[PDB]
Design an enzyme around this catalytic site. Structure first.
Site, short mmCIF file in Angstrom:
data_model
loop_
_atom_site.label_atom_id
_atom_site.label_comp_id
_atom_site.label_asym_id
_atom_site.label_seq_id
_atom_site.Cartn_x
_atom_site.Cartn_y
_atom_site.Cartn_z
N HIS A 200 0.80 -1.23 0.00
CA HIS A 200 0.00 0.00 0.00
C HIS A 200 0.83 1.28 0.00
O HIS A 200 0.25 2.36 -0.09
CB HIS A 200 -0.96 0.02 1.19
CG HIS A 200 -2.02 -1.03 1.15
ND1 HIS A 200 -2.76 -1.38 2.25
CD2 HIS A 200 -2.50 -1.76 0.12
CE1 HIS A 200 -3.64 -2.31 1.91
NE2 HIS A 200 -3.50 -2.56 0.62
N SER A 204 -1.18 -0.55 -6.71
CA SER A 204 -1.18 -1.65 -7.67
C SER A 204 -0.72 -1.22 -9.06
O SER A 204 -1.15 -0.19 -9.59
CB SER A 204 -2.58 -2.25 -7.77
OG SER A 204 -3.02 -2.72 -6.51
N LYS A 226 -16.57 -6.59 -6.62
CA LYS A 226 -15.86 -7.46 -7.55
C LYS A 226 -15.24 -8.67 -6.83
O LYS A 226 -15.37 -9.82 -7.28
CB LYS A 226 -14.80 -6.67 -8.31
CG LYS A 226 -14.34 -7.34 -9.59
CD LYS A 226 -13.57 -6.40 -10.49
CE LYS A 226 -13.01 -7.14 -11.70
NZ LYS A 226 -12.36 -6.23 -12.68
N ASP A 227 -14.57 -8.43 -5.70
CA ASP A 227 -13.97 -9.53 -4.95
C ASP A 227 -15.03 -10.43 -4.33
O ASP A 227 -14.80 -11.64 -4.20
CB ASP A 227 -13.04 -8.97 -3.87
CG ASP A 227 -11.69 -8.54 -4.42
OD1 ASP A 227 -11.43 -8.79 -5.61
OD2 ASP A 227 -10.90 -7.97 -3.65
N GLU A 270 1.80 -35.59 -3.67
CA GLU A 270 0.64 -34.76 -3.97
C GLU A 270 0.90 -33.94 -5.22
O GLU A 270 2.05 -33.61 -5.54
CB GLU A 270 0.33 -33.85 -2.78
CG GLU A 270 -1.09 -33.31 -2.75
CD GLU A 270 -2.12 -34.40 -2.54
OE1 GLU A 270 -1.82 -35.37 -1.83
OE2 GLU A 270 -3.23 -34.27 -3.09
C1 HEM Z 1 -0.35 -16.66 1.45
C2 HEM Z 1 0.20 -16.21 0.32
C3 HEM Z 1 -0.17 -14.84 -0.28
C4 HEM Z 1 -1.18 -14.02 0.05
C5 HEM Z 1 -2.27 -14.26 1.11
C6 HEM Z 1 -1.10 -12.84 -0.79
C7 HEM Z 1 -1.95 -11.76 -0.77
C8 HEM Z 1 -1.94 -10.71 -1.67
C9 HEM Z 1 -3.01 -9.77 -1.90
C10 HEM Z 1 -4.37 -9.76 -1.19
C11 HEM Z 1 -2.63 -8.91 -2.84
C12 HEM Z 1 -3.50 -7.74 -3.37
C13 HEM Z 1 -3.42 -7.56 -4.88
C14 HEM Z 1 -3.82 -8.81 -5.61
O1 HEM Z 1 -4.70 -9.55 -5.09
O2 HEM Z 1 -3.27 -9.07 -6.71
C15 HEM Z 1 -1.28 -9.28 -3.25
C16 HEM Z 1 -0.51 -8.65 -4.19
C17 HEM Z 1 0.74 -9.06 -4.58
N1 HEM Z 1 1.36 -10.25 -4.25
FE1 HEM Z 1 0.83 -11.46 -2.71
N2 HEM Z 1 0.00 -12.98 -1.61
C18 HEM Z 1 0.59 -14.19 -1.32
C19 HEM Z 1 1.70 -14.71 -1.93
C20 HEM Z 1 2.48 -14.06 -2.86
C21 HEM Z 1 3.54 -14.66 -3.64
C22 HEM Z 1 3.90 -16.16 -3.49
C23 HEM Z 1 4.05 -13.71 -4.45
C24 HEM Z 1 5.20 -13.75 -5.49
C25 HEM Z 1 6.05 -14.77 -5.67
C26 HEM Z 1 3.32 -12.49 -4.17
C27 HEM Z 1 3.53 -11.27 -4.78
C28 HEM Z 1 2.60 -10.26 -4.86
C29 HEM Z 1 2.75 -9.03 -5.59
C30 HEM Z 1 3.99 -8.64 -6.41
C31 HEM Z 1 1.64 -8.31 -5.43
C32 HEM Z 1 1.32 -6.92 -6.02
C33 HEM Z 1 1.41 -6.97 -7.54
C34 HEM Z 1 0.55 -5.90 -8.18
O3 HEM Z 1 -0.23 -5.23 -7.46
O4 HEM Z 1 0.65 -5.73 -9.42
N3 HEM Z 1 2.37 -12.74 -3.21
N4 HEM Z 1 -0.90 -10.38 -2.51
O1 LIG Z 2 -8.22 -7.50 -2.36
C1 LIG Z 2 -7.36 -6.49 -2.22
C2 LIG Z 2 -6.91 -6.14 -0.98
C3 LIG Z 2 -7.40 -6.72 0.31
C4 LIG Z 2 -8.91 -6.63 0.48
C5 LIG Z 2 -9.34 -7.12 1.86
C6 LIG Z 2 -8.88 -8.56 2.10
C7 LIG Z 2 -9.32 -9.11 3.44
C8 LIG Z 2 -9.05 -10.43 3.79
C9 LIG Z 2 -9.44 -10.94 5.01
C10 LIG Z 2 -10.10 -10.12 5.90
CL1 LIG Z 2 -10.59 -10.76 7.44
C11 LIG Z 2 -10.38 -8.81 5.59
C12 LIG Z 2 -9.99 -8.31 4.36
C13 LIG Z 2 -7.36 -8.64 1.92
C14 LIG Z 2 -6.95 -8.16 0.54
C15 LIG Z 2 -5.87 -5.10 -0.86
O2 LIG Z 2 -5.37 -4.78 0.21
C16 LIG Z 2 -5.40 -4.38 -2.13
O3 LIG Z 2 -4.55 -3.50 -2.03
C17 LIG Z 2 -5.97 -4.79 -3.40
C18 LIG Z 2 -5.58 -4.14 -4.57
C19 LIG Z 2 -6.14 -4.50 -5.79
C20 LIG Z 2 -7.09 -5.49 -5.84
C21 LIG Z 2 -7.50 -6.14 -4.69
C22 LIG Z 2 -6.94 -5.80 -3.45
#
Ligand code: HEM
Ligand SMILES: O=C1C(=C2CCC(c3ccc(Cl)cc3)CC2)C(O)=C(O)c2ccccc21
Ligand SMILES: CCCCCCCCCCCCCCCCCC(=O)OC[C@H](COP(=O)([O-])OCC(O)COP(=O)([O-])OC[C@@H](COC(=O)CCCCCCCCCCCCCCCCC)OC(=O)CCCCCCCCCCCCCCCCC)OC(=O)CCCCCCCCCCCCCCCCC
Ligand SMILES: CCCCCCCCCCCCCCCCCC(=O)OC[C@H](COP(=O)([O-])OCC[N+](C)(C)C)OC(=O)CCCCCCCCCCCCCCCCC
Ligand SMILES: CCCCCCCCCCCCCCCCCC(=O)OC[C@H](COP(=O)([O-])OCC[N+](C)(C)C)OC(=O)CCCCCCCCCCCCCCCCC
Ligand SMILES: CCCCCCCC/C=C/CCCCCCCC(=O)OC[C@H](COP(=O)(O)OCCN)OC(=O)CCCCCCC/C=C/CCCCCCCC
Ligand SMILES: CCCCCCCC/C=C/CCCCCCCC(=O)OC[C@H](COP(=O)(O)OCCN)OC(=O)CCCCCCC/C=C/CCCCCCCC
Ligand code: HEM
Ligand SMILES: O=C1C(O)=C([C@H]2CC[C@H](c3ccc(Cl)cc3)CC2)C(=O)c2ccccc21
Lengths: 378, 56, 104, 45, 69, 45
Positions: A200, A204, A226-227, A270
């Site tokens: 943040h 994005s 959307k989500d 798996e």
């Molecule tokens: C438990 C595992 C993960 C969780 C819960 C998680 C969660 C999130 C969430 C909620 C976002 C918000 C934007 C979106 O949904 O695209 C995000 C963005 C992003 N995630 Fe994670 N992520 C995880 C693992 C990873 C991994 C494995 C990678 C890369 C190897 C990664 C790299 C990124 C990047 C680069 C963004 C921002 C990219 C953009 O906004 O263009 N994340 N992640």
């Molecule tokens: O979904 C998200 C998001 C977030 C929304 C709320 C989610 C969330 C998950 C669990 C709980 Cl208990 C509350 C909120 C977590 C991801 C987040 O921070 C962004 O910055 C974002 C940017 C682009 C598109 C999607 C997102």
């Protein structure tokens, strides 16, 4: 001021998911992070329930799961949900990684590195859960994964025996698997929060790879609904997998309890692991095999360093796109080879697939980027 | 002019948020029962002769 | 020699394949904003800056609407304007000069 | 990089060499003392 | 403001702000609207009626406004 | 408190009474529907 902005906890929530400025033009590929979080939450809940009936002892583990699935009210569906949620978790994870490789979001270095950490943690967790039933496949999986540290030249065997707690795999190791599987998900949660904190600060990326500060919209109501739509879809798929076709991904050899004296003729982990297994199978040397196994994932950390293009996204870069999809097919090939016996056609095919994977990441993409630059005259 | 159905529905029920919520709880009470009964009927009918309820 | 016409041929092919012209965009619009590029954008005169901003917003709107411009309005390969290149070259020269001072 | 080839960088590296090998001594002796590494500690009177 | 026509009109508000204080101001305005729709009380209404009386009688001073009326 | 004794507060409370008992109905029926509370649900035709 509105209460929305009266207070630190509330104002952090507001900056997170009410008045956050998001790109107007991001697509479905950006829904998979929220689905990942959902999956983590589902896993923690269903796990806390299962935990209250499972037995971390080699003389009752198997039978405790039998008890869960036969006598506990609706325990069978709770089991089903846990097991299928893990699969969904990895599906979303792979798609989430691939997006960022395609659209150039690895240039957000902190987010990318914390993502790599999260990948590693999730894999550890999933594997340490897979051995708890103490079936015939679980046992030998444990065995192999704990012998991996024997490859360390000076101190390895001692590390193996210090993780076993004895001369061999046994009761003292199962309780270790269970304690670690209990604690890891929460570390994953904390690191996820750090991950989003880092995100943040910049905001994005988007499909075009150009700056979107002229067309930002608020997160609420647009991306909230959307989500929510994405979540509804995921739940439809998960229910159909849980109730209509529960045995699709299931393995019969884990319905036979463990026998320390016999390894079954046909071995298969798996599905989300097959590809690593194939890589591990492809090197005729122990140490080299393990090294390749770990480098296959650790290589993501130097992709930002090998970036030569003037443009960020592949949307406008066709040669690049062609290579991207070829890489994805190499990974499919490794997955297919992992399923097959260790026999000659598959041996040779797997070796080619491995060399082409590393080749492509380390050499071909950089060079195509330079060619592309020259074609646009800069 | 034209007292139409959806306009009466807006003005009586949906205009005020509390009453909207009340409408929703009241609708779910009756939907649940009707929907259960229909589903159970269909299910029972698909495989008559094979369920132990009737063999009993 | 002919080699010029041949290279220009492949270059035009690559340009039409890239397709940013379908969105009404110039090549210099599509650069990633690293440090030097941002400084070059700072140096633009007002008219160029405003034209760039509107062009980019318009492309983003189209991408939102999964649409493209009419073919009549696509950017053509033979009448494009590299408006940002000159400023960028100066920025890079300045940085190179400073580096070279820093090693003595 | 190619930037960091030149006189100032040579001088600057020479300035820090001694501190570098002193920290090296610290790390080596500490590792040995911490892991009761007999290969080194058997030579200490 | 209220702007009347034969069969329709506009009923609303107009304001000027620093660029960092548009959101708060919109919040305040719409909140006052909701307040009047749901929670009005007699004491304020009395004041408004007196303000309206004063306006009506103040406007019609001199021949020009009267002719125009 | 002693502040909130007076005409305006009486008027203001009267303004919100109906919404209050409507939300009360919502909560009561929801609780009953959620806990299959037979004490209330046996009277629903
Ligand atoms: C438990 C595992 C993960 C969780 C819960 C998680 C969660 C999130 C969430 C909620 C976002 C918000 C934007 C979106 O949904 O695209 C995000 C963005 C992003 N995630 Fe994670 N992520 C995880 C693992 C990873 C991994 C494995 C990678 C890369 C190897 C990664 C790299 C990124 C990047 C680069 C963004 C921002 C990219 C953009 O906004 O263009 N994340 N992640
Ligand atoms: O979904 C998200 C998001 C977030 C929304 C709320 C989610 C969330 C998950 C669990 C709980 Cl208990 C509350 C909120 C977590 C991801 C987040 O921070 C962004 O910055 C974002 C940017 C682009 C598109 C999607 C997102
Ligand atoms: C018994 C079990 C029963 C199970 C029942 C399951 C029922 C599932 C119902 C699902 C309904 C979903 C509805 C979603 C609505 C969302 C609306 C929305 O906003 O969408 C936006 C979203 C797109 O987002 P976006 O913003 O555009 O961004 C995306 C891209 O960036 C945009 O980039 P682009 O514009 O460049 O891309 C253009 C183009 C790009 O095109 C290409 O790349 C080219 C493609 C060419 C293909 C050619 C044909 C094939 C190849 C042949 C080649 C030749 C071979 C020759 C061989 C020779 C051999 C010798 O891509 C598309 O247009 C793709 C559109 C189609 C998407 C399909 C999605 C499939 C989902 C499958 C789910 C499966 C799991 C179900 C559960 C199972 C449980 C057991 O999707 C859409 O717009 C499409 C919505 C409609 C999708 C309907 C899918 C129905 C699937 C039914 C499956 C039933 C069978 C299941 C089998 C299971 C087996 C185990
Ligand atoms: C991975 C396992 C093995 C690891 C082994 C570790 C080996 C290295 C151990 C080094 C110990 C000594 C380091 C001293 C550094 C002092 C720096 C400093 O700022 O000092 C001045 C500061 C401030 O002093 P001052 O402010 O009064 O003045 C300092 C000013 N000068 C320098 C000019 C004099 O002093 C401190 O407050 C330092 C406190 C350090 C506390 C360290 C506790 C010991 C922890 C390590 C030992 C335990 C390891 C256990 C391993 C078990 C394995 C099974
Ligand atoms: C402690 C356990 C027992 C708890 C039982 C709970 C009882 C009360 C249940 C009430 C359900 C209906 C509430 C509706 C409120 C709508 C308010 C609103 O803003 O709506 C308009 C909003 C926005 O609508 P809009 O923006 O399109 O327009 C609204 C504008 N007006 C009002 C003028 C029409 O709609 C929503 O998005 C509301 C979504 C609500 C989702 C609720 C899901 C159900 C959760 C509760 C049921 C499950 C309980 C399980 C218990 C199990 C026990 C074992
Ligand atoms: C239970 C068994 C599970 C098996 C494994 C499941 C996961 C793997 C699934 C592989 C197949 C995925 C196919 C996805 C649909 C592809 C559609 C397609 O080609 O569309 C191209 C279309 C073109 O659009 P643009 O270039 O943006 O321009 C259009 C606007 N003018 O969209 C794209 O190219 C978007 C691509 C986004 C990334 C997709 C990544 C898919 C694969 C990811 C997982 C692969 C494994 C892990 C990879 C990383 C490993 C380090
Ligand atoms: C006995 C059976 C159960 C009965 C249940 C009855 C309750 C049913 C559900 C009612 C839900 C609440 C609806 C009304 C909420 C009113 C909130 C409110 O007035 O606060 C709004 C206002 C908004 O803030 P600003 O933006 O600054 O406002 C400025 C405006 N210009 O204040 C706030 O910030 C919100 C304050 C929220 C207060 C919520 C109070 C909740 C009380 C719940 C009681 C439940 C009792 C259950 C009893 C069970 C049996 C023992
Ligand atoms: C990212 C989060 C999690 C993942 C990926 C995960 C994964 C898994 C997997 C794959 C299994 C084996 C499935 C099978 O044998 O069919 C399993 C089993 C188990 N997990 Fe989870 N788990 C997670 C969270 C948790 C948590 C937080 C707990 C808390 C106690 C937990 C408790 C258990 C228990 C008791 C079992 C054995 C029961 C069984 O095999 O059905 N899990 N886990
Ligand atoms: O022979 C094997 C084997 O080689 C693995 C392997 C698969 C890859 C795993 C892996 C380790 C590390 C990472 Cl980062 C990813 C996957 C380690 C265990 C198994 O999972 C297995 C399961 C059941 C019976 C036999 C076996």
């Amino acid at each position: 001021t509105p209460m929305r902005k009266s207070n630190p906890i509330m104002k952090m929530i507001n900056h997170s998911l009410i008045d956050l400025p998001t790109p107007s033009n991001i697509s479905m590929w950006w829904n998979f992070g929220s689905l990942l979080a959902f999956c983590l939450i589902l896993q923690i809940i269903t796990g806390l329930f299962l935990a209250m009936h499972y037995s971390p002892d080699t003389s009752s583990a198997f039978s405790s799961i039998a008890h869960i699935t036969r006598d506990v009210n609706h325990g069978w569906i709770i089991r089903y949900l846990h097991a299928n949620g893990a699969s969904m978790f990895f599906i979303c994870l792979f798609l989430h990684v691939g997006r960022g490789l395609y659209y150039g979001s690895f240039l957000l270095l902190k987010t990318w590195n914390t993502g790599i950490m999260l990948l590693f943690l999730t894999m550890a967790t999933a594997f340490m859960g897979y051995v708890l039933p103490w079936g015939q496949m679980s046992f030998w999986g444990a065995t192999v994964i704990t012998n991996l540290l024997s490859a360390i030249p000076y101190i390895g065997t001692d590390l193996v025996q210090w993780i076993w707690g004895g001369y061999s795999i046994g009761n003292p190791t199962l309780s270790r698997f269970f304690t670690l599987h209990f604690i890891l998900p929460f570390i994953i949660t904390a690191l996820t929060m750090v991950h989003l904190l880092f995100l943040h600060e910049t905001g994005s990326n988007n499909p075009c790879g150009i700056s979107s500060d002229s067309d930002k919209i608020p997160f609420h109501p647009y991306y909230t609904i959307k989500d929510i739509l994405g979540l509804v879809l995921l739940l439809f798929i998960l229910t159909t997998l849980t109730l209509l076709s529960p045995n699709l991904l299931n393995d019969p050899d884990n319905y036979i309890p463990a026998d320390p004296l016999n390894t079954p003729p046909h071995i298969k982990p798996e599905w989300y692991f097959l590809f690593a297994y194939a890589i591990l199978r492809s090197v005729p040397n122990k140490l080299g095999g393990v090294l390749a196994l770990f480098l296959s994932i650790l290589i993501l950390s130097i992709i930002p360093t090998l970036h030569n293009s003037k443009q960020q996204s592949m949307m406008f870069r066709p040669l690049s796109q062609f290579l991207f999809w070829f890489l994805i097919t190499t990974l499919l090939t490794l997955t297919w080879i992992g399923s097959q016996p260790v026999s000659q056609p598959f041996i040779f095919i797997g070796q080619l697939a491995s060399t082409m994977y590393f080749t492509t990441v380390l050499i071909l993409m950089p060079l195509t980027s330079l060619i592309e630059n020259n074609l646009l005259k800069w | 002019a034209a007292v139409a159905f959806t306009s009466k529905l807006y003005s009586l029920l949906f205009r005020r948020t509390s009453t909207f919520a009340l409408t929703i709880v009241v609708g779910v009470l009756f939907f649940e029962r009707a929907f259960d009964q229909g589903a159970d009927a269909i299910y029972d009918h698909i495989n008559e002769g094979k369920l132990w309820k009737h063999i009993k | 020699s002919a080699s010029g016409k041949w290279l220009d041929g492949i270059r035009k092919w690559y340009y039409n394949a890239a397709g940013f012209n379908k969105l009404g965009l110039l090549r210099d619009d599509t650069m990633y904003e690293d440090e030097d590029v941002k400084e070059a954008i700072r140096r633009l005169p007002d008219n160029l800056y405003n034209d760039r901003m509107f062009r980019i917003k318009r492309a983003l709107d189209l991408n939102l609407k999964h649409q493209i411009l009419p073919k009549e309005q696509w950017t053509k390969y033979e009448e494009e304007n590299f408006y940002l290149e000159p400023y960028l070259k100066e920025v890079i020269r300045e940085r190179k000069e400073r580096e070279e001072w820093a090693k003595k | 990089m190619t930037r960091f080839l030149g006189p100032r960088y040579r001088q600057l590296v020479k300035n820090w060499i001694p501190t570098a090998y002193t920290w090296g001594a610290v790390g080596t002796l500490g590792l040995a003392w911490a892991a009761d590494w007999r290969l080194i500690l058997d030579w200490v009177p | 403001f209220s702007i009347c026509y034969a069969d329709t009109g506009l009923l609303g508000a107009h304001f000027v702000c620093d660029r960092m204080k548009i959101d708060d101001m919109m919040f305040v305005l719409q909140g006052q609207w909701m307040r009047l729709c749901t929670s009005a009380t007699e004491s304020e209404v009395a004041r408004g009626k007196n303000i309206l009386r004063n306006a009506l009688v103040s406007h019609l001073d001199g021949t020009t406004p009267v002719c125009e009326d």
